[PDB]
Amino acid sequence: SHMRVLFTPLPASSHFFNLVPLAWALRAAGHEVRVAICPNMVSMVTGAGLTAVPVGDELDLISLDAVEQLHLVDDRSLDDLMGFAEKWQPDLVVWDAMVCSGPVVARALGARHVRMLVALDVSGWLRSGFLEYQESKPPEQRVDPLGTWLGAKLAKFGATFDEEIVTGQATIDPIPSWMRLPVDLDYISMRFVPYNGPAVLPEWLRERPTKPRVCITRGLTKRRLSRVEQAMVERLLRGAARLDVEVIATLSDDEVELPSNVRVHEYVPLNELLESCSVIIHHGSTTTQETATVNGVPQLILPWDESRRAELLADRGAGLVLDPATFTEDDVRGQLARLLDEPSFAANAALIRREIEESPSPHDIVPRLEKLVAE
Amino acid sequence: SHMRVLFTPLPASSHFFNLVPLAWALRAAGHEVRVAICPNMVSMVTGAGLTAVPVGDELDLTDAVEQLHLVDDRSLDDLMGFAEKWQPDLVVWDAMVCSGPVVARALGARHVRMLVALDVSGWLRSGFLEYQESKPPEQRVDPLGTWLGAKLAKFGATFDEEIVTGQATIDPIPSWMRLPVDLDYISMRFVPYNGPAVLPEWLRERPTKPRVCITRGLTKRRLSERLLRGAARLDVEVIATLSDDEVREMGELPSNVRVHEYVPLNELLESCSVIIHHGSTTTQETATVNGVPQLILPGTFWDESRRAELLADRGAGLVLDPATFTEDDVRGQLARLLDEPSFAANAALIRREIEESPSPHDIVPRLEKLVAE
Numbered sequence A: 001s002h003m004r005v006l007f008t009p010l011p012a013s014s015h016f017f018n019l020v021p022l023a024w025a026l027r028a029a030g031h032e033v034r035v036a037i038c039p040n041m042v043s044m045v046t047g048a049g050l051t052a053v054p055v056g057d058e059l060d061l062i063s064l065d066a067v068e069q070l071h072l073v074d075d076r077s078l079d080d081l082m083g084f085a086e087k088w089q090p091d092l093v094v095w096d097a098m099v100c101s102g103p104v105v106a107r108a109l110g111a112r113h114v115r116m117l118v119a120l121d122v123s124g125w126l127r128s129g130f131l132e133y134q135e136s137k138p139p140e141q142r143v144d145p146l147g148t149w150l151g152a153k154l155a156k157f158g159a160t161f162d163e164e165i166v167t168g169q170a171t172i173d174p175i176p177s178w179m180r181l182p183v184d185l186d187y188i189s190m191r192f193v194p195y196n197g198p199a200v201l202p203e204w205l206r207e208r209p210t211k212p213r214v215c216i217t218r219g220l221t222k223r224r225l226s227r228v229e230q231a232m233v234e235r236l237l238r239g240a241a242r243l244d245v246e247v248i249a250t251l252s253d254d255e256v257e258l259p260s261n262v263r264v265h266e267y268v269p270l271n272e273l274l275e276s277c278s279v280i281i282h283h284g285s286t287t288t289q290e291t292a293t294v295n296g297v298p299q300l301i302l303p304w305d306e307s308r309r310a311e312l313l314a315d316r317g318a319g320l321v322l323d324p325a326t327f328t329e330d331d332v333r334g335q336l337a338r339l340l341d342e343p344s345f346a347a348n349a350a351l352i353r354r355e356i357e358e359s360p361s362p363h364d365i366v367p368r369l370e371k372l373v374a375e
Numbered sequence B: 001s002h003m004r005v006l007f008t009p010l011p012a013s014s015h016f017f018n019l020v021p022l023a024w025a026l027r028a029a030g031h032e033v034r035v036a037i038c039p040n041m042v043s044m045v046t047g048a049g050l051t052a053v054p055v056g057d058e059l060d061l062t063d064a065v066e067q068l069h070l071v072d073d074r075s076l077d078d079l080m081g082f083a084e085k086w087q088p089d090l091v092v093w094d095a096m097v098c099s100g101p102v103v104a105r106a107l108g109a110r111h112v113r114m115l116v117a118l119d120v121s122g123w124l125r126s127g128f129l130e131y132q133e134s135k136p137p138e139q140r141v142d143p144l145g146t147w148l149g150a151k152l153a154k155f156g157a158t159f160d161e162e163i164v165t166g167q168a169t170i171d172p173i174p175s176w177m178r179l180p181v182d183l184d185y186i187s188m189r190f191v192p193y194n195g196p197a198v199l200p201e202w203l204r205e206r207p208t209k210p211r212v213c214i215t216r217g218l219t220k221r222r223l224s225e226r227l228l229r230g231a232a233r234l235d236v237e238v239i240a241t242l243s244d245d246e247v248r249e250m251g252e253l254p255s256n257v258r259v260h261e262y263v264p265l266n267e268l269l270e271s272c273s274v275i276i277h278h279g280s281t282t283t284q285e286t287a288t289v290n291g292v293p294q295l296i297l298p299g300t301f302w303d304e305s306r307r308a309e310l311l312a313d314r315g316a317g318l319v320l321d322p323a324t325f326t327e328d329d330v331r332g333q334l335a336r337l338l339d340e341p342s343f344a345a346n347a348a349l350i351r352r353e354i355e356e357s358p359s360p361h362d363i364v365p366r367l368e369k370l371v372a373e
């Protein structure tokens, strides 16, 4: 192997999935890749065929001092990682934009670090707002709580603060260029490649449909909590079925009696499904969204700023939006009917898809990173 | 570009793992990748992060040789059915299956055969291809060509030599081990995928004495023969820590034998000074790219011998005559690998060479081009 690469993803499937392909792209180049993950999400990682370094105490990131844990930057955890990291000596850490964990270790270690977005650059945009204001102030008042508080963890390992710890040496952007918030950083445009958990293709998913297909999903991380109202889905699902189509609703144990043209599963490999859908209806989250977008499928979204990206997608003519408060089954139907009927969306979605499939693939990104490590 | 690519592995762990990196290589490149697999084993596919496509009936390794080569009706028909539909551009096939290339020919998709052993099929085949040429036209029987040709019939298809060897063969075996055979060989850098891998605590702490790693295969582990006891029992005889394999009982292990059911092979090998293995390929190769001097007690049921013999030629291993190796052989040899900086000095040279080979990553634009030729 040339490079030893460490990933520090947030401990939740969507945030993790969004790392998988690049992880492998790298692997396929011949670099060693490890994924650092709290020891209860271990088999998530192993599941994507990647090697998992359990680190810290268990964490039910969903159910969630307490502020520290969420971003993997608390004492208990960081130390373990740092402990391995120290021993392991990666040349590069690629880190989910919501954990501080990995850049702390990176600076402590001197290894290049790269932030990867699973959403619009709020952190960086905001952070940008700030740096500029703080700018004009009386130098003695140039406060920076985020920075200093970090410098303290940082100092724990003989490291000092840098702007870099907040936004990384680079930020890899998988949401499409046009959608990307204006904020003057070094952005690396990567084509989103879908990984949707473990994918098995059952027989029924092998034939062309015979009525136009509709997908109705909310990925895991949302819905799933629940676990310990509700109403909107049965609304969406009722409204949807009013139209002469097969609705695949991807649901957990919960209800209810359903329309005849509606079939329900706990998990179906979405990407695969979406090759055969005519319209997707989803809840604005991001891995779900691009799998849709990346598959040319027109969209019906019920909303990061899940609104904003869904608004942005609306705008460019590949989808529409309802308001989760004021929405009635009618709007569901009528909206769906538009998406399925006026072929602009079908079209507008394809142009966006063609666009997407010409941004650099993960595979295309690898050398751009080796390049970065050689500097 | 944007290909639709289907893999068709022999359904064994070794075999499938050997394909994973290329599989991912391509998905990473934004290609759709699909793995045709007997129902009972789809977990292994999903386990590696690739999309399983369940095909045929169960299979445990419709007359047998046909099932064992993925070429029975149940499989073939399934594989076709789906293939017809998904209409792949490229089919990559486990050199020991016939299902891929058939379905491939049938829909006129470029296919490519992928190797796991050396190339005994090709060696043997082309030998026959040479000999038959030197016979009169009325006598040049191709028993294999007929046998394939027929199946092909089913689907509107003719036989072509390419069904036997692919339109090109991807060789992950270090090219100096390569049997002399005139084919379109694509050299590929072995990239170990070993199954599911998690870092155990023990493996965090730096080794305090040489780490020897003994693996039965894996996986197989058939039967379920204790040349393995005599294996372990005469390494203990030197001051080394031994990481093992299995949950088999043979009375009292010595104290320096740290047994663990499953280890992650790649990872493990990073602290190891030596490895004793059965001579199989992911094992050999995982070990080779790790620069680890090997002791091979090979045999057996394929090219394990020749390759163990070839590695040995380049002074990076030593070999043990199974069934005739004494306990004191397994030390006196072990000891040679640990005491002679030649064996690592080589195990490095070879490795280094392999890293100069192109990666799965590097092999994409070529298959890309193959498909658009």
Ligand SMILES: Cc1cn([C@H]2C[C@H](O)[C@@H](COP(=O)(O)OP(=O)(O)O)O2)c(=O)[nH]c1=O
Residues within 6 Å of the ligand: A013, A014, A015, A017, A195, A196, A197, A217, A218, A219, A220, A221, A222, A223, A250, A266, A267, A268, A269, A270, A271, A285, A286, A287, A288, A289
């Ligand atoms: C429910 C469900 C989810 N998924 C996958 C698709 C996505 O990759 C992932 C969810 O992504 P996302 O919508 O980003 O999840 P969340 O908003 O809850 O974090 O789960 C399926 O593939 N099939 C399914 O049926």
Ligand SMILES: Cc1cn([C@H]2C[C@H](O)[C@@H](COP(=O)(O)OP(=O)(O)O)O2)c(=O)[nH]c1=O
Residues within 6 Å of the ligand: B013, B014, B015, B017, B193, B194, B195, B215, B216, B217, B218, B219, B220, B245, B261, B262, B263, B264, B265, B266, B280, B281, B282, B283, B284
């Ligand atoms: C026992 C064991 C096997 N393995 C895996 C890694 C290799 O890819 C595979 C070895 O299979 P291989 O060498 O191909 O032999 P066989 O053909 O008998 O299966 O087993 C581990 O990763 N760790 C382990 O502890």
